Scaffold this motif. Sequence first.
Motif, PDB file in Angstrom:
ATOM      1  N   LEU A 195       0.836  -1.186   0.000  1.00 46.89           N
ATOM      2  CA  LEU A 195       0.000   0.000   0.000  1.00 46.89           C
ATOM      3  C   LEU A 195       0.880   1.248   0.000  1.00 46.89           C
ATOM      4  CD1 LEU A 195      -2.880   1.004   0.006  1.00 46.89           C
ATOM      5  CD2 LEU A 195      -2.805   0.967   2.502  1.00 46.89           C
TER       6      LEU A 195
ATOM      7  N   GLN B 216       2.588   1.766  -3.462  1.00 42.22           N
ATOM      8  CA  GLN B 216       1.654   2.269  -4.469  1.00 42.22           C
ATOM      9  C   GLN B 216       1.384   3.752  -4.275  1.00 42.22           C
ATOM     10  OE1 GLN B 216       0.748   0.299  -7.276  1.00 42.22           O
ATOM     11  NE2 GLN B 216       2.377  -0.659  -6.064  1.00 42.22           N
ATOM     12  N   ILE B 217       1.260   4.168  -3.025  1.00 38.70           N
ATOM     13  CA  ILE B 217       0.941   5.553  -2.735  1.00 38.70           C
ATOM     14  C   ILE B 217       2.127   6.487  -3.011  1.00 38.70           C
ATOM     15  CG2 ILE B 217       0.496   7.138  -0.817  1.00 38.70           C
ATOM     16  CD1 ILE B 217      -1.679   5.330   0.152  1.00 38.70           C
TER      17      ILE B 217
ATOM     18  N   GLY C 254       2.867   6.605  -6.805  1.00 44.62           N
ATOM     19  CA  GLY C 254       1.787   7.300  -7.479  1.00 44.62           C
ATOM     20  C   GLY C 254       1.795   8.809  -7.316  1.00 44.62           C
ATOM     21  N   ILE C 255       2.165   9.283  -6.134  1.00 46.92           N
ATOM     22  CA  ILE C 255       2.207  10.709  -5.876  1.00 46.92           C
ATOM     23  C   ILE C 255       3.338  11.351  -6.679  1.00 46.92           C
ATOM     24  CG2 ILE C 255       2.841  12.420  -4.105  1.00 46.92           C
ATOM     25  CD1 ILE C 255       1.159  10.650  -2.147  1.00 46.92           C
TER      26      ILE C 255
ATOM     27  N   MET D  52       4.605  10.261  -9.451  1.00 46.32           N
ATOM     28  CA  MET D  52       4.207  10.245 -10.857  1.00 46.32           C
ATOM     29  C   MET D  52       3.134  11.287 -11.166  1.00 46.32           C
ATOM     30  SD  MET D  52       4.224   6.447 -12.438  1.00 46.32           S
ATOM     31  CE  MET D  52       3.118   5.742 -11.219  1.00 46.32           C
ATOM     32  N   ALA D  53       2.220  11.501 -10.220  1.00 43.33           N
ATOM     33  CA  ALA D  53       1.129  12.466 -10.390  1.00 43.33           C
ATOM     34  C   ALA D  53       1.675  13.855 -10.686  1.00 43.33           C
ATOM     35  CB  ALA D  53       0.257  12.509  -9.132  1.00 43.33           C
TER      36      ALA D  53
ATOM     37  N   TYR E 192       1.939  13.911 -14.437  1.00 48.09           N
ATOM     38  CA  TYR E 192       0.869  13.282 -15.210  1.00 48.09           C
ATOM     39  C   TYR E 192      -0.221  14.280 -15.592  1.00 48.09           C
ATOM     40  CZ  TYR E 192      -3.265  10.404 -16.176  1.00 48.09           C
ATOM     41  OH  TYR E 192      -4.412   9.935 -16.760  1.00 48.09           O
TER      42      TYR E 192
HETATM   43  C1  HEM Z   1      -3.665   0.894  -3.572  1.00 46.07           C
HETATM   44  C2  HEM Z   1      -3.059   1.847  -4.405  1.00 46.07           C
HETATM   45  C3  HEM Z   1      -2.958   1.847  -5.785  1.00 46.07           C
HETATM   46  C4  HEM Z   1      -3.080   0.859  -6.709  1.00 46.07           C
HETATM   47  C5  HEM Z   1      -3.454  -0.648  -6.548  1.00 46.07           C
HETATM   48  C6  HEM Z   1      -2.793   1.450  -7.977  1.00 46.07           C
HETATM   49  C7  HEM Z   1      -2.794   0.773  -9.180  1.00 46.07           C
HETATM   50  C8  HEM Z   1      -2.535   1.373 -10.412  1.00 46.07           C
HETATM   51  C9  HEM Z   1      -2.577   0.695 -11.680  1.00 46.07           C
HETATM   52  C10 HEM Z   1      -2.952  -0.775 -11.917  1.00 46.07           C
HETATM   53  C11 HEM Z   1      -2.194   1.587 -12.615  1.00 46.07           C
HETATM   54  C12 HEM Z   1      -1.848   1.343 -14.057  1.00 46.07           C
HETATM   55  C13 HEM Z   1      -0.436   0.768 -14.158  1.00 46.07           C
HETATM   56  C14 HEM Z   1       0.092   0.749 -15.590  1.00 46.07           C
HETATM   57  O1  HEM Z   1       0.702   1.745 -16.009  1.00 46.07           O
HETATM   58  O2  HEM Z   1      -0.104  -0.248 -16.295  1.00 46.07           O
HETATM   59  C15 HEM Z   1      -2.041   2.863 -11.960  1.00 46.07           C
HETATM   60  C16 HEM Z   1      -1.669   4.036 -12.609  1.00 46.07           C
HETATM   61  C17 HEM Z   1      -1.424   5.265 -12.012  1.00 46.07           C
HETATM   62  N1  HEM Z   1      -1.529   5.517 -10.665  1.00 46.07           N
HETATM   63 FE1  HEM Z   1      -2.040   4.153  -9.262  1.00 46.07          FE
HETATM   64  N2  HEM Z   1      -2.536   2.798  -7.841  1.00 46.07           N
HETATM   65  C18 HEM Z   1      -2.634   3.063  -6.495  1.00 46.07           C
HETATM   66  C19 HEM Z   1      -2.430   4.303  -5.890  1.00 46.07           C
HETATM   67  C20 HEM Z   1      -2.101   5.498  -6.526  1.00 46.07           C
HETATM   68  C21 HEM Z   1      -2.050   6.788  -5.880  1.00 46.07           C
HETATM   69  C22 HEM Z   1      -2.340   7.220  -4.391  1.00 46.07           C
HETATM   70  C23 HEM Z   1      -1.724   7.688  -6.830  1.00 46.07           C
HETATM   71  C24 HEM Z   1      -1.464   9.027  -6.536  1.00 46.07           C
HETATM   72  C25 HEM Z   1      -1.872  10.004  -7.475  1.00 46.07           C
HETATM   73  C26 HEM Z   1      -1.665   6.985  -8.087  1.00 46.07           C
HETATM   74  C27 HEM Z   1      -1.371   7.561  -9.318  1.00 46.07           C
HETATM   75  C28 HEM Z   1      -1.294   6.867 -10.521  1.00 46.07           C
HETATM   76  C29 HEM Z   1      -0.876   7.431 -11.773  1.00 46.07           C
HETATM   77  C30 HEM Z   1      -0.312   8.850 -11.881  1.00 46.07           C
HETATM   78  C31 HEM Z   1      -1.003   6.461 -12.704  1.00 46.07           C
HETATM   79  C32 HEM Z   1      -0.627   6.565 -14.189  1.00 46.07           C
HETATM   80  C33 HEM Z   1       0.848   6.165 -14.380  1.00 46.07           C
HETATM   81  C34 HEM Z   1       1.010   4.705 -14.725  1.00 46.07           C
HETATM   82  O3  HEM Z   1       0.375   4.254 -15.696  1.00 46.07           O
HETATM   83  O4  HEM Z   1       1.734   3.982 -14.012  1.00 46.07           O
HETATM   84  N3  HEM Z   1      -1.901   5.642  -7.889  1.00 46.07           N
HETATM   85  N4  HEM Z   1      -2.234   2.711 -10.599  1.00 46.07           N
END
Ligand code: HEM
Lengths: 352, 352, 125, 125, 55, 55, 430
Positions: free
Chosen positions: E40, E43-44, E47-48, E50-51, E54
Amino acid sequence: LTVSARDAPTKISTLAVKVHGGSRYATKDGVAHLLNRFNFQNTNTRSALKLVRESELLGGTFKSTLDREYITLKATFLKDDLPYYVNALADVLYKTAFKPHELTESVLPAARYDYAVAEQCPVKSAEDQLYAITFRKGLGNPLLYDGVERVSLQDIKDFADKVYTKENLEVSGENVVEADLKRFVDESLLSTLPAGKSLVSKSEPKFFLGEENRVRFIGDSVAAIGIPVNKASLAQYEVLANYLTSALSELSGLISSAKLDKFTDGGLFTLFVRDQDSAVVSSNIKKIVADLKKGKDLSPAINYTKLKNAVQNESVSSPIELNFDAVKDFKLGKFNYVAVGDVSNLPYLDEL
Amino acid sequence: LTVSARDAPTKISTLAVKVHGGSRYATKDGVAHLLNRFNFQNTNTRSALKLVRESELLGGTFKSTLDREYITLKATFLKDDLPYYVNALADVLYKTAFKPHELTESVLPAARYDYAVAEQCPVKSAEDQLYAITFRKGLGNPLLYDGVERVSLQDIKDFADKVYTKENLEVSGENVVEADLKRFVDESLLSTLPAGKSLVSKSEPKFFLGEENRVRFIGDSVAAIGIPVNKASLAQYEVLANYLTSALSELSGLISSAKLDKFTDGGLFTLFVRDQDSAVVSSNIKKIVADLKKGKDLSPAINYTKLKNAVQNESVSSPIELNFDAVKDFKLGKFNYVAVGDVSNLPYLDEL
Amino acid sequence: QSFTSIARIGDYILKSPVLSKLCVPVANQFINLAGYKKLGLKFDDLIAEENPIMQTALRRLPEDESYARAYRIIRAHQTELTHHLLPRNEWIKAQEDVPYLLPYILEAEAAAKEKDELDNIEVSK
Amino acid sequence: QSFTSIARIGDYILKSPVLSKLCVPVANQFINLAGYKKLGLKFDDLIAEENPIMQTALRRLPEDESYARAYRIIRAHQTELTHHLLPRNEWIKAQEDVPYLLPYILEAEAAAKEKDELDNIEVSK
Amino acid sequence: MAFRKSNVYLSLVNSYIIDSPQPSSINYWWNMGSLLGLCLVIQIVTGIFMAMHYS
Amino acid sequence: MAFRKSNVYLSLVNSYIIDSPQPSSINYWWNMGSLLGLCLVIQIVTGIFMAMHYS
Amino acid sequence: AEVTQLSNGIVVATEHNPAHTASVGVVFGSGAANENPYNNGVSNLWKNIFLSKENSAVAAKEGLALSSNISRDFQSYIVSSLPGSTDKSLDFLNQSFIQQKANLLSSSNFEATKKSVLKQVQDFEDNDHPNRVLEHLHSTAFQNTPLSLPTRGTLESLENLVVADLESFANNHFLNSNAVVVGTGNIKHEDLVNSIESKNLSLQTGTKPVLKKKAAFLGSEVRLRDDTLPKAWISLAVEGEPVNSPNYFVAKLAAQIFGSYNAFEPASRLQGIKLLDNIQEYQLCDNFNHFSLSYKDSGLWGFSTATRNVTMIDDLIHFTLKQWNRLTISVTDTEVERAKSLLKLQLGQLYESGNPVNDANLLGAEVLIKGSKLSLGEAFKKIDAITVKDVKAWAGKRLWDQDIAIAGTGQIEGLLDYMRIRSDMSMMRW
Ligand code: HEM
Ligand code: HEM
Ligand SMILES: COc1c(O)c(C)c(C/C=C(\C)CC/C=C(\C)CC/C=C(/C)CC/C=C(\C)CC/C=C(\C)CCC=C(C)C)c(O)c1OC
Ligand SMILES: COc1c(O)c(C)c(C/C=C(\C)CC/C=C(\C)CC/C=C(/C)CC/C=C(\C)CC/C=C(\C)CCC=C(C)C)c(O)c1OC
């Protein structure tokens, strides 16, 4: 198996099974207490729970009291439900389960609370002390259980065996048709009990005079005297007790209580002086022992102490009556004495 | 103001201020206990805390013991620090603060624990019972406080006033130069104490014989006898006690303890039979009372009971000696008796 | 599933000598494959205890059985964490694998069932 | 700021009749403007109690003063919440506004200060 | 008592992570939950960051 | 005991919001904290719904 | 079972059954509800000289026993005889209430009696916490209204009472039109009524008492916090039924449904009361008992309780009031039926004890209010006729979303505010 009764046009009857198994006859200390506390627990056919739930719906309650001599199993109910309570009482005497967990979960707690209530009332600590020094091992046995010697579940069972017999009990129904009662007793488990022996000894209990005990106690102070009475000389002491607890005596407001405990073979007269501080207890008894040593009476209460000895309605089943219109004089011989409370500030036996 | 001493080439001295204020002379119950527990609390110049912190750095401790007759304030220390502990003991006797909060926070707790330790050892419950029935109000006063009658802070102060006087105490230093000790006592607050009176009455304490008490107790059972002794007939009872507690007597392994408590004006002989079950306690004392009733001796321990009565080194300051090489015979007259424990299974006084 | 119900079904099978000879061998072999005896446990040690019936039952267990259950459970955890079984001479034998807690459980279930029955009794006039 | 220190400064002012005649009138007028007497409080009721000195002190207060402090505090809260003051005949008078807790506080501070001194004593040989 | 117990925030940490009484015999299958908390967090955090880039 | 007390989640609610012992005399100045929690909620809810449309 | 009441110049009421002794007494239709705030305790004081050592020795010579009882609506003075002496009891009654009612109030007698009811009422307030609480319940429930005055009087009205206050009260209430003479025991109606119509002389006949203002229930509380007591004792009630209410018996039955309890009595823990499932888990109390108290103008329906569980008092109150909610919405047939049987049993044990002094008090109080006594068998007819529908209609009027009155003493910090208790007098619905 003496089955008494007495009818009336009323609505509430009360069955009662008196049984000679109080502290008087007790193999181990407090076992009569524990057994009394074990009554109306589980039988082998009926749980304590179902007994209560059933009797409630019918409209009657149970209750088991302990004396210095009697264990009485009483049942109060609506009139026309007689057979049920006869068989309920029968069930208890014949076949209570005596499960080990009933001992630990219900009987020992209930007994511990009994002992605790009594442990804090200093006249009762005195009354127990009075019995224990007069009759040293008969009626002077402890009334309640306190664990000074071990009592196992078996000891409670063994004692139930001795005491619950056809020869050692009397059925007694108030507000009952004697015809149906005798009919229901003989048709039950009552008549199917073993009938061992009764321990109602005729011989006068051997009591020792001029005895005193002193117990230290935080609370009220109480000084008490106790006199052994005769099997025939007891009805004069009865008027004495009712004289001392009446407006005829000048020294009625100097004592807390006075009574005669009547048994099957004699009795005990008790007098209780109780107050906060030890100064007022010392005086009020030092006066009594001096005022009754030069005693009196002149049969003043002879109709009043006959009033009081009559308004004990339950008594009937009552012993000697016209012994009041007989002797009217009273001395004060040797007695027994206990000081409970502020002991370093209470009279010894010497100075009374 | 008897200032004793005795030097030696050692390193540890022990000052000691004996004071006649034990339970013997006690206006209210346990007040001597409370006062003993109040020693080494706060004075008016020194807190209890500073006293401890100072004496620790010097290398000495304090301690205050309670007897049936004495309150002893003792101090154990390194030799050359004598003046400090003389003035410390002086400070306590003259000017302890007796603050109300010291009562509630330190003294009453410490006393309550004292009473609790003693409440659970059944020989001590017996020993107290023995004193209370022999000497009914002198040495038979309660040793420890238990709150049966009120004791206020004032009562503790009033009692300190009576008992802490120049006429009622003896300074006594072991391993001290008598010259410097007397010099330091006279130069202190000791000589500036009021000197009231001493209550060391010469008259023999009036004891009542053929007395017995029975206390119910959860735990071990103990039967005890106690005999009043004479001011001169006490050194034979001493050999008796040491005979019964030796391999010479066949019945030594039948008792727990036997001793003579020597006072300023007589004494008390005690014998303790203690065991788990009531059967073994009944026999082992029923035998003793029968074996000593047809008693004996022939001075077998006369050098051994002189060995034991000598190895009590602290004693010196010791009473009568050559009373052993005098009488060697012993009967067994009337005594006093207490049963503690499984009481419904222990001998009465009749059958001994 | 209540132990009253397991006892009902089980006793029916145990009496009828058709089923009794058919099933008990299956059951015996199931118990050996279970393996709890190799850890030093009796089956009744395995009963989930976090409910009022089992707490009543364990409360009513005599002291000596209680201390024994405690040892067997502690010994089982220690052996489990070492990834061993006990020495075979320490295994519980079938003669020892008694339903020691069962009577207390059945007793408590009956008491409970009666209370539920009595709290809900209807009345007819 | 300790009460030992407030007492030091205050007593110095109270003795020297230069300051004593200058300040006490100022102080008297400050106390009346404060207003706590119109709520039925004594100053010592106002001392913040959530520390060991004040808990020691309140513990040592005689029963009768303790019950009285309790009433004055409860009565003050009730009046505060009704946005009133008490009837003037119920106000605390200056004769009543005594430092009743002060001696217990000062005593506890001294005891505490000594312990801190003794826990940290150096030694010289 | 120890500070880890007496402090309002640390006692939470203590009762969940430090003094928490575990059955002696839990095996590595009981490690998955901490791995889920870790997941967890991964992922957080990723993701932040990357955000930030993005659209 | 009452369910609001015995339940693991509700007891938090009960001890903070229902049975929490307040001094009888706190005035309206002690209402600001709840107003701050409300503010925090207004900002978060309106921000998330706007984020849905924001580049 | 008899009820023979007939009026000559006075009103005479008897109920005879061959027992043993006989009890004769006069029962006045005025009690503590007729006193003031300022002469409160005058009736209790009257009672206490009537039983004084002087008057009590004169009766004990004759072999007579004395008994008195002060209540709210009424007042009774009773002599018990040995049943042929049914005439010598009437001698002692008149020798006291005509002759000695100017000799009982002697200076030395009054001062030694006043000193004894002062130690008496003080002892009550210091130590009898359950009855103390129940007395304060009436005090706040019925404040500034006749039922609020305590029966023993207050320490302050008592110590300021003089002989003239006794006199003035006796001259306004011990009248003929405010009296009933009662005989219980075994003595016949015509055995007593003839001994009464033997002597004439009316004494203050034609004189009425003084009228007043009606009693009213006010929802309120009095909290007697005392942290030094080892328990909390609380009583809580709604406005109940007056005697001669249609719902007199419905109310009494409703109280029997929840009944009374004692945690230390094994049998008590087993009763068919649903509330016991809730309160026994954490042991929320040592005891409780429900009551339906009925007086002339009003009554109280509620319960009293005692507890050492001082941190869970709010669960005690909450579970008890949730049970009471059920009476309006979900009380079952078998709960009602259980209550019928137990109400009969307890009403029986009251009306037919083996003690005629109780019989006199029960007879006296009844006939003073409705001019007759309903027979025990007549009550059972009324009790058996009560349906679930009746209890629901009653509870929906008296219990549901109604004001309450509260009193307590001891460690009651955990007894929550009024509005919290009062909100539990109902439930949320769609
Ligand atoms: C339990 C948490 C999370 C899970 C399971 C999760 C899962 C995923 C998945 C499956 C993707 C697509 C991956 C791919 O590129 O094929 C994705 C993309 C993305 N997530 Fe999350 N995410 C989580 C939390 C977060 C959080 C808190 C943010 C904060 C903004 C975030 C931002 C993004 C962004 C910017 C993308 C697009 C970039 C990318 O494709 O990798 N994610 N996420
Ligand atoms: C304590 C919480 C918050 C505070 C004090 C706050 C404050 C602000 C402020 C001062 C602005 C500029 C307002 C203006 O337009 O002049 C703003 C804009 C914005 N906020 Fe927040 N914000 C908070 C939470 C959030 C959250 C959780 C989100 C969720 C994504 C968010 C999303 C936005 C967006 C989308 C904008 C641009 C739209 C706009 O200008 O109003 N905000 N915020
Ligand atoms: C009784 O049983 C237990 C048990 O109780 C525990 C606790 C454990 C041990 C396991 C754990 C304690 C897991 C704990 C972890 C969590 C509860 C995590 C919760 C989740 C989160 C996502 C945390 C919050 C994080 C953030 C907001 C991220 C912070 C962001 C940052 C710093 C951004 C930085 C970047 C910039 C540009 C400023 C056991 O193993 C166990 O059984 C064996
Ligand atoms: C002892 O003193 C106290 C006291 O303790 C309390 C509690 C109060 C009462 C005040 C409060 C209880 C305030 C409580 C509030 C909070 C702690 C709030 C915390 C903050 C948050 C932001 C909550 C979390 C919210 C979210 C994640 C938003 C949910 C988002 C949603 C539903 C998005 C929906 C949209 C779509 C498209 C799905 C007092 O007044 C008080 O003194 C008088």
